[PDB]
Amino acid sequence: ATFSRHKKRLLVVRELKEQAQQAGLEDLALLEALSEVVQNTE
Amino acid sequence: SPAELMMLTIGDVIKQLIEAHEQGKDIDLNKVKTKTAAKYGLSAQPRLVDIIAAVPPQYRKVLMPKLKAKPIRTASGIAVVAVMCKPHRCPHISFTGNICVYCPGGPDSDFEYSTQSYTGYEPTSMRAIRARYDPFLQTRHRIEQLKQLGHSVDKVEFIVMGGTFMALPEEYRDYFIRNLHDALSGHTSNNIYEAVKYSERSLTKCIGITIETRPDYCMKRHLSDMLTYGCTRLEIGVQSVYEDVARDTNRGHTVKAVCESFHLAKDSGFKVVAHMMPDLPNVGLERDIEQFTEFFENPAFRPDGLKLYPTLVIRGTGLYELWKSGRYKSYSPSDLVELVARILALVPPWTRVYRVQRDIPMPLVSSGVEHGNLRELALARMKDLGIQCRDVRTREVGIQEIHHKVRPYQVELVRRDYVANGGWETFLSYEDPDQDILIGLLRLRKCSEETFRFELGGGVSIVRELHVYGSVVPVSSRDPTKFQHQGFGMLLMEEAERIAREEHGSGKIAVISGVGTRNYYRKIGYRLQGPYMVKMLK
RNA sequence: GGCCCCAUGGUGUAAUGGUUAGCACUCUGGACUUUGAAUCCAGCGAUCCGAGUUCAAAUCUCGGUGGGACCUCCA
Ligand SMILES: CC(=O)SCCNC(=O)CCNC(=O)[C@H](O)C(C)(C)COP(=O)(O)OP(=O)(O)OC[C@H]1O[C@@H](n2cnc3c(N)ncnc32)[C@H](O)[C@@H]1OP(=O)(O)O
Ligand SMILES: C[C@H]1O[C@@H](n2cnc3c(N)ncnc32)[C@H](O)[C@@H]1O
Ligand code: MET
Ligand code: SF4
Ligand SMILES: [Mg+2]
Ligand SMILES: [Mg+2]
Ligand SMILES: [Mg+2]
Ligand SMILES: [Mg+2]
């Protein structure tokens, strides 16, 4: 559940930033937290 | 009571500072101020002057390089003291019936007890009013203020302001000059020559004096008289290069007289600074650009310094009556900023701009300039347009160090030659090319065929200025983080002595100088003759 | 001794769990070779201290430290 939630949050943030790029730092923490989750799973 | 709390806060601040100095660690002043003010329950913060005014003597000596205030006041290498004369009437009141059409204040005006071209509400004006126009008191008071700030007053230069100084009786001028010299040295003299001798032997060096004068009061007599006083700089108001403007404003002279006075003064050995005024009547927005282009391209006009004074309309003058009648209108602020930017883009690299606008208080002005920082607005506009200013003031080490954060790296030697006022001028300098940073300069001129002084006839070349910038280094001291006492002066004189012998073909070299400079040039190998320091080149 | 509430820049004060705290007095610097103190324009400076709950706390739970209200006790 944590992996799914944080990955969907990362996807939402990434899509928002991408839409800003075409129109024109939560992602870092989300990526690090997902890395920690995968590390615990390992 | 807040007073003793303030005193205890101050004492604690110096206690921490001196302790940190004793065990030798760096300390941040603002955080200490805030923390210490928090303890004793205050609603304000300490001031720098108060902290300076409570240091013990030896610590006062040691820890000023951390508590100094307003570092600009000695960022050019000297300390400037401004004094004013006695109120009087301008000389051309008689044979014309009136004075310039735009000059405010004076003996016959509603500004009580004020000098001509001033209102009396200015900083220097209020200093001399309470001193009742006494040079000794003014000099002492200003030096006391400068020392209280935390600066070094080893090297001093005077500026005499007011109306036309050289139109006063001889006795008053004697009194004024000898009192200035005595105030510096500490002697009690009777006439000019005694004061000059004692000031030559003094320890608080008098670098030079500056006087403001009119073109019709700059002749051989007046030039010799100013030479005996120790003066080395002149300020003349040109205001325009157009002949119709010089007579529609009741100026009282002509432009040709200005050019002739320039020629005489430069051959005698002085330095020339010119006052100019944009936005004069009958001068549109297109004649100003042509005016200044001719000013800086025509050899008859090229000065050494400039003062830009945009026209202001003030009550009680003829221009005020013109403005009320709906016949004169000022520029719009955007147009004025654009014009000033364009003008500043034209200044040659050998010219220094001292000031950019007047200092009249805003409520007294009926129309004209209203802001107070025209220079920096103009610089920002210039950055927007893509052009750059390359005068002397905005290229020296101190200004480049406080406005930007740069330091010289690759110093080189530069020489520029030109023709001006019928003479062959050279300008030597040490500067960094890549970052555009100036360090030291020297001016040299070959005497023309119309020199009248006895000491300069027969093949003499004259040096008009030598200067090295940075912060002030006291005499006989050295500071490896500053730029003055590191040998840039004897390098600039050795080159001036080679041009004057192998290229000018002269057989003697002369220097106009102050008094501490007299001792310096005696150290180099020059002797004294008249008011000059001379040396044989054969 | 229990008993309810208060704490953000040096001082007076604003703001709703978002993805980064706004104003006033004070202070410092420049235009300025006519000026520490005036004018114009820039700048520095804060969620007391611990645990925490919620994806996330200045913000909500429980604490210590000070303060304010009730009687203290006490001698
Ligand atoms: C002549 C004129 O019109 S004025 C000269 C300019 N006026 C000024 O003082 C403003 C700044 N001036 C300066 O930088 C210097 O005073 C200059 C221009 C005279 C010489 O510049 P510098 O590069 O510093 O000189 P330099 O390093 O070659 O000489 C250093 C020596 O000069 C001495 N010196 C400097 N100024 C003076 C002075 N006014 N009187 C006597 N000696 C002096 C120093 O004490 C030092 O002597 P020491 O170290 O052997 O004891
Ligand atoms: C002292 C200097 O002030 C300048 N000056 C004199 N009157 C005015 C004015 N009304 N507005 C602007 N500058 C003025 C002149 O250039 C003079 O030389
Ligand atoms: C103080 S005004 C400038 C000096 C002199 N009065 C002149 O008009 O040239
Ligand atoms: S000569 Fe100078 S001081 Fe005298 S009235 Fe004219 S502008 Fe003013
Ligand atoms: Mg508070
Ligand atoms: Mg509040
Ligand atoms: Mg709140
Ligand atoms: Mg200020």
Per DSSP, the residues of B198-211 read HHHT-SSEEEEEEE
Integer distance in angstroms from CA B135 to C1' C47? Answer: 57
Return the ligand 1 atom nearest residue B78 CA. Answer: 10
Instruction: Confirm whether any atom of chain C, the nucleic acid strand, is less than 7 Å from CB of B373.
Output: yes
* Cβ atoms < 10 Å from Cβ of B499: 18
* Cβ atoms < 10 Å from Cβ of B315: 13
Residue B471 gets the label, from left (phi > 0), alpha (psi -120 to 50) or beta, of beta
Integer distance in angstroms from CA B49 to C1' C27? Answer: 12
Residue B489 annotated as part of some ligand binding site = yes
**Annotated resolution, angstroms:** 2.9
| b/e map B418-453, b = 16+ CB within 10 Å | eebbebbbbbbbbbbeeeebbbbbbbbbbbeeebeb
* Cβ atoms < 10 Å from Cβ of B184: 23
Determine the nucleotide nearest to B81 by Cα–C1' distance: C33
Using a 7 Å cut-off to protein CB atoms, list the covered nucleotides of chain C: 9-11, 19-20, 25-41, 44-45, 55
Q: Which amino acid is at B472?
A: V
Determine the nucleotide nearest to A2 by Cα–C1' distance: C55
With a Cβ cut-off of 6 Å, ligand 3 is lined by B 117, 163-164, 212, 214, 236-237
Continuous segment of H or E residues that includes residue B507: none
Q: Which amino acid is at B107?
A: P
Q: Long-range contacts for B322-331 (Cβ within 8 Å, ≥24 apart)? A: B322/B281, B323/B366, B323/B367, B328/B281, B330/B279, B330/B367, B330/B368, B331/B279, B331/B285
Q: Give distance in angstroms: CA of B43 to centre of ligand 3.
A: 49
CA atoms within 13 Å, Cβ hemisphere of B35: 9
Q: Looking up tokens 């209020």, which residue turns up? A: B126
**What residues are paired with B307 via a beta bridge?**
B275, B355
* Torsion (CA) B162, B166, B170, B172 in degrees, nearest 10: 10
Residue B215 CB–ligand 4 contact under 6 Å: no
Contacts of B261 (CB under 8 A, 6+ apart): B215, B218, B219, B236
Rounded distance, CA B367 to CA B323, Å? 9
Instruction: Confirm whether any atom of chain C, the nucleic acid strand, is less than 7 Å from CB of B394.
Output: no
Strands B305-308 and B272-276, how do they pair?
parallel
Instruction: Confirm whether any atom of chain C, the nucleic acid strand, is less than 7 Å from CB of B73.
Output: yes
Best CA proximity match to B32, nearest among B265, B63, B18 = B18
Rounded distance, CA B230 to CA B193, Å? 10
- What would you measure as the largest C-alpha separation in chain B, in angstroms? 77
Best CA proximity match to B354, nearest among B312, B399, B414 = B399
Instruction: Confirm whether any atom of chain C, the nucleic acid strand, is less than 7 Å from CB of B32.
Output: no
User: Which tokens hold the place of B424?
Assistant: 């062959």
CA closest to C1' of C30 belongs to B403
Breaks after residues in chain A, judged by C–N over 2.5 Å:
24
Q: Is the CB of residue B189 less than 8 Å from the CB of residue B171? A: no
Q: Is the CB of residue B462 less than 8 Å from the CB of residue B496? A: no
Q: Long-range contacts for B495-498 (Cβ within 8 Å, ≥24 apart)? A: B495/B413, B495/B428, B495/B442, B496/B428, B496/B442, B496/B444, B496/B463, B497/B535, B497/B537
**Proximal ligand: closest to the CA of B524:** 1
Q: Give distance in angstroms: CA of B186 to centre of ligand 8.
A: 34
Q: Looking up tokens 């001006």, which residue turns up? A: B420
Contacts of B427 (CB under 8 A, 6+ apart): B350, B415, B416, B417, B418, B441, B442, B443, B444
Q: Give distance in angstroms: CA of B372 to centre of ligand 6.
A: 39
Instruction: DSSP for B462-493, please give it.
Output: EEEEEEE-SS---TT---TTSSSTTTHHHHHH
**Cα-Cα end-to-end distance for chain A:** 16
Rounded distance, CA B114 to CA B40, Å? 47
**What residues are paired with B79 via a beta bridge?**
B156
| b/e map B516-531, b = 16+ CB within 10 Å | bbbebbeeeebeeeeb
Strands B155-161 and B205-212, how do they pair?
parallel
Rounded distance, CA B155 to CA B108, Å? 38
Contacts of B419 (CB under 8 A, 6+ apart): B299, B425
Q: Is the CB of residue B410 less than 8 Å from the CB of residue B433? A: yes
Contacts of B131 (CB under 8 A, 6+ apart): B137, B138, B141
Integer distance in angstroms from CA B373 to C1' C29? Answer: 14
Query: How big is chain A by its Cα radius of gyration, in Å?
Result: 12
Instruction: DSSP for B205-231, please give it.
Output: EEEEEEEE--GGG-SHHHHHHHHHHTE
Determine the nucleotide nearest to B374 by Cα–C1' distance: C31
Q: Is the CB of residue B451 less than 8 Å from the CB of residue B480? A: no
**Proximal ligand: closest to the CA of B41:** 5
